[PDB]
Design a protein around this ligand. Structure first.
Ligand SMILES: CCCCCCCCCCCCCCCCCC(=O)OC[C@H](COP(=O)(O)OCCN)OC(=O)CCCCCCCCCCCCCCCCC
Ligand SMILES: CCCCCCCCCCCCCCCCCC(=O)OC[C@H](COP(=O)(O)OCCN)OC(=O)CCCCCCCCCCCCCCCCC
Ligand SMILES: CCCCCCCCCCCCCCCCCC(=O)OC[C@H](COP(=O)(O)OCCN)OC(=O)CCCCCCCCCCCCCCCCC
Ligand SMILES: CCCCCCCCCCCCCCCCCC(=O)OC[C@H](COP(=O)(O)OCCN)OC(=O)CCCCCCCCCCCCCCCCC
Ligand SMILES: CCCCCCCCCCCCCCCCCC(=O)OC[C@H](COP(=O)(O)OCCN)OC(=O)CCCCCCCCCCCCCCCCC
Ligand SMILES: CCCCCCCCCCCCCCCCCC(=O)OC[C@H](COP(=O)(O)OCCN)OC(=O)CCCCCCCCCCCCCCCCC
Ligand SMILES: CCCCCCCCCCCCCCCCCC(=O)OC[C@H](COP(=O)(O)OCCN)OC(=O)CCCCCCCCCCCCCCCCC
Ligand SMILES: CCCCCCCCCCCC(=O)OC[C@H](COP(=O)(O)OCC[N+](C)(C)C)OC(=O)CCCCCCCCCCC
Ligand SMILES: CCCCCCCCCCCC(=O)OC[C@H](COP(=O)(O)OCC[N+](C)(C)C)OC(=O)CCCCCCCCCCC
Ligand SMILES: CCCCCCCCCCCCO[C@H]1O[C@H](CO)[C@@H](O[C@H]2O[C@@H](CO)[C@H](O)[C@H](O)[C@@H]2O)[C@H](O)[C@H]1O
Ligand SMILES: CCCCCCCCCCCCO[C@H]1O[C@H](CO)[C@@H](O[C@H]2O[C@@H](CO)[C@H](O)[C@H](O)[C@@H]2O)[C@H](O)[C@H]1O
Ligand SMILES: CCCCCCCCCCCCO[C@H]1O[C@H](CO)[C@@H](O[C@H]2O[C@@H](CO)[C@H](O)[C@H](O)[C@@H]2O)[C@H](O)[C@H]1O
Ligand SMILES: CCCCCCCCCCCCO[C@H]1O[C@H](CO)[C@@H](O[C@H]2O[C@@H](CO)[C@H](O)[C@H](O)[C@@H]2O)[C@H](O)[C@H]1O
Lengths: 92, 81, 89, 67, 469, 179, 486
């Protein structure tokens, strides 16, 4: 016995049955290449002196600034209905 | 932002870096039992190495724990790097 | 205790570092069982206990059956290949 | 309730018969007596589980009564 | 019943032709079904977790072991159905899947060894049963002697199991040298905290565990599972694991071991990572079994682990049988038969199965997402109960490793589904051959169990609370 | 706390790493493929001895130093030790971003390992099972795993701090007209 | 009569309909509208003067697994609705039929599987809003990922494989930490139910640990910076029904999860941790908006737009102010109206005509496609928060709450009002503006179906923007149930 699939299996092509509509878009190629580049930038990214700058800014420094501000300003301000001479701060 | 953070570092700590990390770790894991010439001597050596390494590691942790930690880190490095 | 540990350890090393034969692997397994049985029987004598000798005679029987089955498996391997080489099990 | 459990177990049996017929690449009503046989079989399993559970609860209640 | 079956089948097979072995398998399958139906009322003996010692004090019978035995009968029923019923009545499927004459006898003897492992209370019984399992499963790996790969695997498995059995015997005889006993009932609080005894006990545990592929000793068994026939792999990858892990769970031997924790972490990481570059199906499933063995190693450190282990081993057995059955069913649609023994090897041969059989791919999806542990399926509740136990007992780093392994394993579990739901040219339109009714029903029943067993979890817990507490 | 002896533990560290590197070099020599001898154990080893020794020295030195600088025993010391060990393992690849990533990621990993208790095992007297659990009975101090229907307000104010809603007296009673 | 008789009648009718007409979409749309009507009847029969849970029912009990429980020992899954649940339930039943009708004519291969998966995801989300324990919530929170994987993989765009793997793996990653949290809760309390879980006061040092897992899940599902990168890919490469469902309901499941799992329990951990939430939310707002300003794909732009508004909603819900909670809920509802309309425009109108989403091809739709331009302008100015739309009401009140809680962060977060306008109008101006593109031929304007969908979604947001107060009869308890002030 030569091990081959069953002869009973009749096979045919995959036909998704869509109505082929006319060409509504004339693809450009340059735009498509620009789009592929800008969509799959993630696979070509490399750490350099320019990229690491933005990383250590936006993922280290700016969160640290916001966090210092947030944890110092935690329960500092309470100025509902406050009046002249009354302190709007709870602490010093 | 869009290219160095959102499509850079956050994909590296993400789908790209994990993919490369796991490619290398998988390749190192499967290219460990190196020689298909003889499957018996190799795995026999693995039994020997496992028993010896375990005995010495249990000695080391009885002596003091924190010394065994970098030994295990280096073993993972040898197995997965 | 000493003779058995020595035979066991040397048989294990001669199993692990065998780049020569398959017969040496069989021999090292059998000598390992021998070493265990000798430690077992020395403890049987010192404690004046029968459970050790019972376990020992059971090991004799089981090792015989192990040898029979292993040397049937080798014969199947040789049925197909015709030569049992230095390597490749 | 018993009747609910038997109905649901028979539904699981119908699902098994259906999925069997579909794995076989047959229509879903290929041999409709198999639905009846699967129903009674899975309902018997469900009845067994129901009785085991009821005896378990009776045991844990007899313990309280004897306490 | 098993020994009656063995002593009956030996005679009846000796006095029968090779044309009768399939019908013999059918007969003994119905025998096992009748046993599991009529004799399963013995669960009432174990009410309120009453435990019995039998054959002197050589065997132990409780609810745990009764359940594992029912499970092993169920597994043997499925595996015998795969040998006793032809998928298709073609010459191909009469060339690929034929039972050999002695295969059923060896299966039943291996089942006997499995159960005498789980029921063991003395180490002499454990050793005799370990050897009765391992010799029989050597011969099961070797019975298809017209395969080069299978003979090679037979011999590797013989030698490695022999060495690990030497280790088990050394552990047992050292335990005897120290305590003058072969029984673990001889241990208590006082003996544990008065004698340093962990080297012997962990040596026993590792000699038993490396026989099921615990890292770093996994490659040999994965090669054996790859190189064996598919219908032999389905057995030899499951039943030894159940037996040995059930013994090690019933025997509370490694309650807070550091070595077992380390090796379990290693098993998880290896079984998750190494399966990512596997292109073959059986190696992928072997690494899946490895990581599940790691999940079950974790509950050897608990001292209250019956529910988690029983749930997880039952669901893993059902999923394992289902996925191997789906790979067996997919051979009708693969376009290239690789061997007489492993007709399907590579995962990309499953490409386009949804266009030939869509509900087979639904089954595959259910099983894959149970392996991943997606609710409301059964693997999710398994993982949940394991996590519950290990976090109740203080394993917090192992839990994060468990999550990470659950995530990394999903990739190679999803490889199968992804390629299966891809598009293919040259689809199937008609076929006059139909697959078996019985095997189709068995697979559908397993899938329905995976899908709808969560309905009964309340009832199962209420029964457990009476028979195991 | 009790201070750590840095140089002694690190010398033990270095000797242990050296022995482990020798064992790994021997294992590599015996498992390898090509023609090899007793010469090649240190010639053809891929820096295994230096890996083990450097990792061991770095981890133990940094751990004990941070424990003596911080004057504490906690998981941040394991974070620093992992940072140092990763720096050693990443200096092998002669690249800056890989070095930084190795440092940061193994720092995070070993710091998680220390956060969880610095153990692959369990404590087993701090676990939930062996510890007092459930509802606490009569005004007793709530332990870690215990549950309470109603907590003390002084405790809340100390744990959280005054401000942002949370005050030592409720607002309505504190602004109730003394009538 | 019987229960089984009635559902067997429905089942037999479904089988015969499928036999005669080989499609399921008509029956599923009938069931869609029937479920909407039943939920409206439940709202008619809903008491607004009780904070309790109503229409309770229990499933998978020991005594009746295939039925409802009346037991004195409850071991199954609990279900029941509060006003908070009912709001999002109304949204869900409103949106499901529109997601089915948005893909009525553009699925020409294996249609029935598409419609089954869509309706199944919708019903899982409905049941998830009906849940009243951690485990039923979880098993309905994670049960969408198989269906979404299959839907996106089979019926998705070019990069559909990557999106399928993302929507499963990212969500599973967060949800497994949620599972660790839930496991800890269950072993410590020995109970999982959303009715009396504010009575159990855990210790602070354990609250602070449970909160971490729940918040990692909420960060991956909301999404929030730095774990927001899956959302552009998934929302872009999915079929239209998937994107609509996702952006409208699955993102709001995280908001509901905060309010239902994390605030009532874990009050002290939350009141200690919320400045970190504010850090993450402000980052998620500003950096995601600026990242939107340099995207070239339309559906991707709308996808990024969802994230900033969900960050504003997080500011509101983590504010410990009644106005902030109400604003976050109104944001969820109004975004669930408006964002699927934008997704329809950019994934079912334009994508169905041109099969491309790169901005460089699109220009001057106003000339041949004027109705579409009117819709684009309306929905853009609604998405950026123009008054008399619920988007503004929600943004306004969420930022009020954020300012009350932290004036500095809550005040800096008000540049959302600008950046939204920038990234939305930079797209609208190009699409509607200029001479019509030379890369595009002329095609039909919007149809009656597309217009029906967009008009429903515009009427709803204009109603809740002109009188937001109509949603208060189901929320005047919820705006005070999750506030920790002594
Ligand atoms: C008791 C304390 C124990 C605590 C644990 C301590 C951890 C010790 C870890 C050391 C063990 C060795 C494992 C090292 C990783 C293996 C692969 C490797 O060497 O990393 C390099 C890899 C390279 O990518 P590339 O540069 O493109 O390829 C050229 C490489 N020569 O790298 C990359 O692909 C890029 C990496 C980018 C960063 C990705 C970070 C993802 C973080 C989530 C990780 C989850 C997966 C964990 C996998 C487990 C693997 C063991
Ligand atoms: C009663 C169970 C339903 C049943 O019997 O299936 C019948 C099948 C169609 O039967 P029909 O086409 O009318 O008759 C064929 C003529 N040779 O109809 C079917 O295909 C039924 C398939 C659906 C079963 C799903 C499980 C239902 C669970 C209910 C609880
Ligand atoms: C099977 C093949 C046939 C060949 C067999 C060869 C003989 C068998 C040797 C023994 C059996 C093999 C054991 C396998 C290794 C694993 C052993 C193990 O894991 O047990 C360790 C156990 C402690 O671990 P655990 O209980 O999990 O954690 C709780 C700690 N309180 O228990 C312990 O604490 C162990 C006690 C520590 C002492 C270990 C002794 C090692 C001493 C070596 C010193 C050598 C001198 C220095 C270096 C020389 C090199 C030049
Ligand atoms: C001489 C003087 C002695 C002085 C006394 C003190 C000495 C201390 C000695 C400690 C033990 C050192 C043992 C070193 C490991 C054994 C050598 C080795 O190389 O192991 C790997 C081995 C071969 O690998 P190789 O052939 O070189 O090829 C690699 C390509 N991937 O192939 C193998 O598979 C064998 C594996 C053995 C592994 C043993 C178990 C290690 C446990 C892993 C820990 C993981 C835990 C970390 C968890 C973190 C989770 C993120
Ligand atoms: C604050 C967040 C800072 C994020 C830092 C991340 C740094 C990083 O991911 O490094 C990636 C590095 C590859 O860098 P690269 O040179 O650009 O790519 C190789 C192709 N030439 O590759 C590496 O860094 C390898 C790091 C792998 C370390 C694995 C750690 C064990 C995890 C368990
Ligand atoms: C949670 C468990 C995960 C389930 C995810 C669903 C996976 C379905 C993938 C396979 C599939 O397509 O379902 C089969 C579907 C029929 O598929 P169909 O498009 O109609 O092709 C012709 C059928 N004879 O049949 C169905 O309609 C089943 C819908 C589910
Ligand atoms: C499925 C389709 C169900 C449609 C809903 C049917 C329904 O809601 O009927 C409710 C009916 C009348 O109840 P009502 O009008 O509200 O008056 C109450 C006064 N006694 O009263 C009833 O019929 C009883 C209540 C019906 C409960 C419906 C439960 C549906 C649950 C489906 C389970 C899905 C399984 C998937 C896994 C779930 C895991 C969480
Ligand atoms: C004990 C099991 C009782 C029977 C049962 O519960 O299962 C019922 C099913 C019936 O399947 P069928 O498709 O209708 O058989 C079709 C057979 N014809 C075509 C010849 C009519 O039996 C099985 O296929 C396998 C059961 C194992
Ligand atoms: C038992 C055959 C196993 C073969 C595999 C089939 C699973 C059967 C499950 C019944 C278990 C039982 O009902 O029992 C509950 C057992 C202990 O109860 P018991 O002492 O064994 O008494 C049972 C008496 N019987 C034999 C007469 C029935 O608790 C457990 O931890 C069971 C955990 C298994 C979880 C898997 C659930 C699968 C969904 C079931 C949908 C019907
Ligand atoms: C460009 C990529 C590289 C940049 C990545 C930056 C990631 C941040 C890593 C720096 C980690 C240093 O983090 C530091 O924080 C803790 C507290 O917060 C310090 O330790 C301090 O902790 C407090 C608790 O908060 C202790 O009770 C004690 O007061 C101690 O002084 C440690 O000395 C150090 O671990
Ligand atoms: C991949 C993503 C990873 C992010 C997920 C992070 C979750 C990690 C779990 C963090 C919580 C662990 O919780 C932690 O809390 C307590 C302090 O409260 C620690 O405190 C305890 O440490 C141990 C070690 O000395 C001792 O018991 C000590 O007396 C103390 O009680 C525990 O060692 C640890 O259990
Ligand atoms: C991602 C979220 C899920 C992470 C997975 C882990 C969840 C479980 C968290 C770890 C629990 C750690 O909890 C452990 O530490 C706490 C201290 O904080 C200890 O609690 C004990 O601390 C001691 C101080 O050392 C005090 O006396 C205190 O009254 C209590 O008895 C316990 O020894 C133990 O309960
Ligand atoms: C999968 C599709 C998604 C569907 C999701 C929508 C589900 C909607 C279900 C809402 C209806 C629940 O309504 C529920 O009312 C009461 C609770 O007081 C339940 O409980 C009622 O049981 C009956 C018992 O005979 C009695 O009337 C009892 O006094 C009680 O009122 C009902 O059994 C249930 O019908």
């Amino acid at each position: 016995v030569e091990l081959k699939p069953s002869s009973a299996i009749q096979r045919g092509p995959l036909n998704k049955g869509g109505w082929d509509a006319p060409h509504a878009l004339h693809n450009d190629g340059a735009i498509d290449r620009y789009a592929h580049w800008r969509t799959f930038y993630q696979e070509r990214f490399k750490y350099t002196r320019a990229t690491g700058k933005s990383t250590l800014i936006f993922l280290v420094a700016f969160p640290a600034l916001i966090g210092y501000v947030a944890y110092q300003s935690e329960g500092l301000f309470e100025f509902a209905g406050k009046r002249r001479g009354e302190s709007v701060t709870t602490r010093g | 932002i869009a290219h160095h953070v959102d499509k850079g570092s956050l994909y590296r700590l993400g789908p790209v870096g994990i993919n490369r990390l796991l490619n290398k770790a998988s390749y190192n894991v499967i290219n460990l039992s190196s020689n298909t010439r003889s499957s018996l001597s190799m795995n026999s050596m693995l039994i020997l190495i496992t028993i010896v390494s375990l005995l010495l590691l249990v000695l080391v942790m009885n002596v003091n724990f924190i010394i065994v930690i970098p030994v295990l880190i280096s073993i993972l490095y040898i197995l997965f790097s | 205790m000493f003779i058995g540990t020595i035979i066991l350890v040397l048989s294990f090393l001669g199993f692990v570092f065998n780049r020569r034969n398959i017969i040496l692997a069989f021999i090292c397994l059998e000598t390992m069982l021998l070493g265990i049985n000798l430690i077992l029987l020395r403890n049987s004598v010192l404690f004046d206990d029968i459970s050790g000798s019972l376990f020992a005679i059971v090991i004799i029987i089981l090792a015989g059956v192990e040898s029979a089955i292993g040397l049937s498996l080798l014969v199947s391997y040789y049925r197909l290949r015709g030569v049992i080489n230095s390597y490749g099990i | 309730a018993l009747f609910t459990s038997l109905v649901g177990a028979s539904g699981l049996g119908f699902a098994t018969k259906f999925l069997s017929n579909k794995i076989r690449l047959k229509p879903a009503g290929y041999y409709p007596l198999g639905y009846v046989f699967s129903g009674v079989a899975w309902a018997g399993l469900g009845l067994v589980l129901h009785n085991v559970h009821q005896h378990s609860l009776e045991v844990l209640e007899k313990k309280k009564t004897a306490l | 019943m098993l020994i009656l079956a063995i002593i009956s089948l030996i005679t009846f097979v000796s006095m029968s032709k090779l044309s009768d072995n399939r019908a013999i398998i059918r007969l003994i399958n119905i025998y096992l079904i009748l046993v599991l139906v009529l004799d399963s009322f013995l669960y009432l003996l174990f009410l309120n977790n009453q435990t019995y010692t039998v054959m002197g004090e050589l065997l132990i019978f409780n609810s745990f072991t009764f359940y594992i035995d029912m499970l092993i009968y169920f597994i043997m029923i499925v595996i015998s159905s795969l040998y006793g019923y032809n998928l298709y009545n073609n010459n191909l499927y009469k060339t690929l899947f034929e039972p050999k004459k002695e295969l059923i006898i060896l299966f039943l003897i291996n089942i006997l060894g499995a159960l005498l492992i789980v029921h063991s209370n003395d180490f002499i019984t454990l050793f005799v049963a370990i050897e009765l399992q391992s010799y029989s499963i050597y011969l099961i790996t070797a019975i298809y002697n017209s395969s080069y790969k299978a003979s090679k695997a037979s011999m590797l498995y013989f030698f490695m199991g022999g060495i690990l059995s030497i280790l088990i015997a050394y552990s047992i005889n050292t335990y005897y040298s120290v305590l003058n006993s072969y029984t673990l009932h001889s241990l208590d609080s006082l003996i544990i905290n008065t004698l340093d005894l962990n080297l012997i006990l962990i040596a026993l545990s590792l000699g038993l565990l490396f026989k099921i592929g615990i890292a770093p000793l996994h490659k040999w068994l994965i090669s054996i599972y790859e190189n064996t026939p598919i219908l032999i792999t389905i057995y030899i990858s499951l039943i030894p694991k159940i037996s040995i892990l059930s013994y090690l769970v019933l025997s509370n031997i490694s309650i807070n071991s550091l070595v077992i924790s380390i090796l379990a972490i290693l098993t998880l990481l290896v079984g998750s990572v190494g399966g990512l570059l596997q292109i073959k199906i059986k190696r992928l499933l072997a690494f899946s079994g490895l990581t599940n063995a790691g999940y079950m190693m974790l509950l050897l450190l608990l001292n209250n682990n019956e529910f988690s282990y029983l749930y997880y081993i039952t669901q893993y057995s059902i999923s394992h049988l289902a996925i191997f059955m789906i790979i067996i069913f997919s051979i009708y649609y693969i376009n290239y038969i690789n061997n007489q023994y492993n007709p399907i090897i590579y995962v990309n041969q499953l490409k386009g199965l949804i266009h030939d059989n869509a509900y087979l791919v639904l089954s595959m999806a259910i099983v894959v997402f149970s392996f991943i542990g997606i609710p409301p399926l059964l693997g999710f509740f398994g993982k949940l109960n394991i996590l519950m136990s290990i976090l109740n007992n203080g394993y917090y780093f192992i839990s994060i490793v468990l999550i990470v392994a659950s995530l990394i394993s999903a990739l190679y579990y999803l490889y199968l589904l992804n390629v299966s739901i891809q598009d293919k040219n040259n689809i199937l339109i008609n076929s006059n051959e139909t697959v078996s009714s019985v095997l189709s029903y068995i697979l559908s029943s397993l899938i329905i169990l995976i899908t709808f067993g969560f309905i009964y979890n309340s009832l199962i817990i209420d029964i457990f609370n009476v028979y195991f507490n | 706390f009790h201070p750590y002896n840095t140089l002694g533990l690190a010398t033990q560290s270095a000797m242990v790493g050296l022995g482990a590197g020798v064992v790994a070099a021997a294992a590599r020599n015996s498992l390898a493929t090509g023609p090899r001898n007793i010469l090649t154990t240190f010639s053809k080893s891929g820096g295994v001895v230096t890996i083990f020794t450097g990792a061991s020295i770095a981890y133990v030195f940094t751990y004990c130093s941070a424990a003596n600088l911080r004057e504490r025993k906690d998981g941040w010391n394991h974070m620093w030790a992992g940072a140092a060990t990763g720096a050693v393992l990443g200096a092998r690849t002669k690249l800056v971003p890989a070095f930084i990533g190795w440092t940061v990621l193994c720092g995070a990993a070993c710091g998680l390992f220390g956060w969880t208790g610095a153990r692959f095992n369990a404590d087993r007297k701090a676990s939930l099972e062996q510890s007092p659990k459930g509802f606490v009975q009569e005004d007793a101090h709530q332990t870690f795993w215990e549950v309470v229907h109603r907590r003390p307000l002084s405790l809340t104010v100390e744990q959280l701090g005054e401000g942002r809603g949370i005050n030592a007296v409720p607002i309505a009673t504190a602004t109730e007209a003394p009538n | 009569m019987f229960l089984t008789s009635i559902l067997l009648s429905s089942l037999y009718l479904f089988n015969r309909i499928l036999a005669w007409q080989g499609n399921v979409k008509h029956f599923y749309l009938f069931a869609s509208n029937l479920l909407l009507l039943f939920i409206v009847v439940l709202y008619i029969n809903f008491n607004t003067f009780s904070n309790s849970f109503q229409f309770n029912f229990e499933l998978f009990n020991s005594l009746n697994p295939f039925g409802l429980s009346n037991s004195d020992i409850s071991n199954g899954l609990l279900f029941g609705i509060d006003g908070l649940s009912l709001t999002f339930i109304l949204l869900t039943v409103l949106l499901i039929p529109l997601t089915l009708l948005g893909n009525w004519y553009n699925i020409n291969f294996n249609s029935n599987l598409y419609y089954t998966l869509v309706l199944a995801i919708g019903l899982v989300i409905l049941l998830n809003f009906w849940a009243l324990d951690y485990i039923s919530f979880y098993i309905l929170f994670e049960a969408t990922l198989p269906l979404l994987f299959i839907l996106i993989h089979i019926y998705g765009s070019s990069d559909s494989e990557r999106a399928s793997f993302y929507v499963l793996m990212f969500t599973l990653s967060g949800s497994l930490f949620m599972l660790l949290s839930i496991v800890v809760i269950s072993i410590v309390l020995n109970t999982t139910n959303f009715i009396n879980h504010n009575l159990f006061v855990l210790s602070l040092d354990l609250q602070t640990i449970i909160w971490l897992g729940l918040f990692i899940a909420i960060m991956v599902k909301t999404p929030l910076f730095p774990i927001h990168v899956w959302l552009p890919v998934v929302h872009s490469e999915s079929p239209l029904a998937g994107s609509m469902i996702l952006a409208g309901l699955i993102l709001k499941l995280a908001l509901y999860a905060i309010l239902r799992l994390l605030l009532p329990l874990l009050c002290e951990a939350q009141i200690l941790y919320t400045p970190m939430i504010y850090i993450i939310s402000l980052l998620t707002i500003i950096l995601t908006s600026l990242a939107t300003l340099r995207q070239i794909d339309l559906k991707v732009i709308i996808a990024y737009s969802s994230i900033s508004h969900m960050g504003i909603a997080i500011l509101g819900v983590c504010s410990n102010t009644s106005l902030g909670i109400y604003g976050s809920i109104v944001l969820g509802v109004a975004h669930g109206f408006v964002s699927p309309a934008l997704f329809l425009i950019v994934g079912g109108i334009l994508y169905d005509r041109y099969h491309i989403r790169i901005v460089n091809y699109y220009k001057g739709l106003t000339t041949y496609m004027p109705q579409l331009a009117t819709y684009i302008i309306i929905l853009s100015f609604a998405n950026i928060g123009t008054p008399l739309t619920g988007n503004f009401t929600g943004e306004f009140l969420s930022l009020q709450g954020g300012f009350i809680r932290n004036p500095i962060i809550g005040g800096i977060s008000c540049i959302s009002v600008l950046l939204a306008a920038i990234y939305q109008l930079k797209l609208t101006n190009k699409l509607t503006g200029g001479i019509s593109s030379i890369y595009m031929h002329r095609t039909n304007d919007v149809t009656i179906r597309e217009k029906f969908i967009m008009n429903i979604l515009i009427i709803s947001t204009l109603i809740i923007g002109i009188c937001p107060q109509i949603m208060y009869n189901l929320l005047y308890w919820t705006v005070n149930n999750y506030i920790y002030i002594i």
